[PDB]
Subunit: 134 residues, 6 copies
């Protein structure tokens, strides 16, 4: 079998705290920079010979993460009572991107994408990902 992909990178800077003794000092209100990498995959190149319009990909990724950027996530109703771990946020961003694909925001071609992955890098030594089908 075979598969093509493209990945584009953005980033966000947020505040949050975690619930649970397991988190140790991360129970305190702190924050992070996450590099946000969105990978789009598909089995065959589209009629422009690409996986997805990078302009739309970067735009739409920007639209998704723009709603999270420069925020204290502990105050965000969408996340009330939920630990906003790096892996959780990877899924949040993946799902919001997936909805934009389904809505045609990445072009009619992007309806033929097979899946996507969102990877968040919280430091030089830790990163998390969420992969899903489309």
């Amino acid at each position: 079998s075979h598969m093509f992909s493209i990945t584009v990178r953005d980033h966000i800077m947020i505040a949050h705290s975690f619930r649970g003794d397991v988190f140790g000092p991360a129970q305190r209100l702190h924050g992070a920079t996450f590099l946000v990498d969105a990978t789009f995959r598909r089995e065959q190149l589209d009629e422009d010979n690409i996986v997805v319009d990078i302009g739309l990909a970067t735009q739409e990724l920007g639209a998704v993460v723009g709603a999270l950027n420069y925020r204290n996530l502990d105050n965000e109703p969408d996340f009330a009572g939920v630990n906003t771990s790096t892996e959780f946020l990877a899924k949040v961003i993946a799902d919001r991107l997936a909805e934009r694909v389904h809505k045609g925001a990445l072009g009619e071609g992007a309806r033929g994408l097979a899946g996507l992955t969102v990877t968040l890098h919280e430091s030089h030594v830790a990163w998390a990902s969420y992969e899903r089908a489309l």
Copy 2:
């Protein structure tokens, strides 16, 4: 199940332009430095306890991308009329590497490889890949 891999990195520096409104300013003649990462995978290590002869892997990758380096791909006969997107080129390189694996250029042990992936990095914020079986 399980899988071993190794990856080696080379790079090329090219010019190209794209055909299609989708591309915006990339319709203009421009260029790219592509970091080219070739990943070779197999289920069991060979008789030397490796995935592939790394010297032959770098040699053969060097030979493949050497045909593209320092060129304007718009004027390359192999790509006449075709958009040489990052993802398209990743397949071109992967298939050329596979051809060399099947001709024995990466050693007889390389015929045991399960597959390969080629990843091209266009910048610090965009990259593409193609995966295939061997």
Copy 3:
């Protein structure tokens, strides 16, 4: 499948070794390497704390695994007697040892629900290797 979560943590080791076989050229001489060691843990559903694995335990257990290898000439390590300690070989060694720790509960009871592990070793800016397995 439908989806997969993962987290990766990075450590590093600095070792000496040499290889057997003419295929290796100058690497037949005793030399060394810095390996960046990335351990990736993957699972289908987040645990009750909303994470893939307790990061504190993941880094501790990865630290303990690679600490046994660090600052050593692997050519004189009994565990690797007669074997080429290639980057890809070492990735499996580290992966398998991490797995053993997962299976003894050392990364938390939740870690028993992990789907798999990948270990990637980076020997330089231009060569890296990996091993992927199920748990």
Copy 4:
């Protein structure tokens, strides 16, 4: 004596060729991706406790490199007869940034900057820089 700085990163993708036997295969029309890092330095923080309006910094870097991006520099009258080496282009961008600072485009406070450095990365294995006082 002490010094503060901040650095912001952008990138361009261009085509060019070089004149002279010294350049070997780079005498052919090809191209490159340059990561462009602009460093602004000052001896004392301004009244907002910063080196420079980072927003204006990232915007102004964007403006400057925007005039170069997605172009064959061989066709740019500004560079007629001149080798557009990585080090030369670092100077071009530094000089254009300097003029923007003088004109007030990075804010009145940016005239208190001591100097700047522009670094262009043409690959994972080569980069060039130009440093100048303001």
Copy 5:
């Protein structure tokens, strides 16, 4: 003349907000992961043929940034009413390391250092530094 240096990297994860129009959305409480690189310089290697005891360098850097880690800096008494910009924090960390050097915490040999630079990376596209003599 000539100069030796060594650099060690640590990181912290913090929350903060800024005061001032210039900051735009960064006036909201957010956060950052800062990669913290401490550079120690000297003219001649010490008796062990090094710039500084790297164990003590990392230990002392660890102690300095450990007092900042996992905190909302807006609520830290040390920074009350002050914008905790990347560049300002670089100086805070440099000065705290200098104090430790002068009390002998990096070894008696470290009293021979010429200077320090601390660089904080807020993302893949923005970083700041502060340089001082010892």
Copy 6:
């Protein structure tokens, strides 16, 4: 104090060594490292080709310098007997050898106009050292 141009090229080596002195802890044992080797050449004015230095000659000569060090146990080298081959020490070794080659004309006659060089060795993702000198 007006301005300065520079170019940097990257190579790497993979070596074994040990350190002498209790200060070094486990690094007193024979181990190894991958050093990414960055050579920076600086000058005030571009040459007649509009460059800092012939990049082909810079990479060739850096490659020649590091090649003499590569895939070796540096503990065995007579020139380094009695000397801890720390990252910072090796940066100067490489810088001094590059300087010799500049001064012999091996990087082109233009390179005689260089103001200086810096060599930076990266031993891991979290430690690096440099040596800066005039030419």
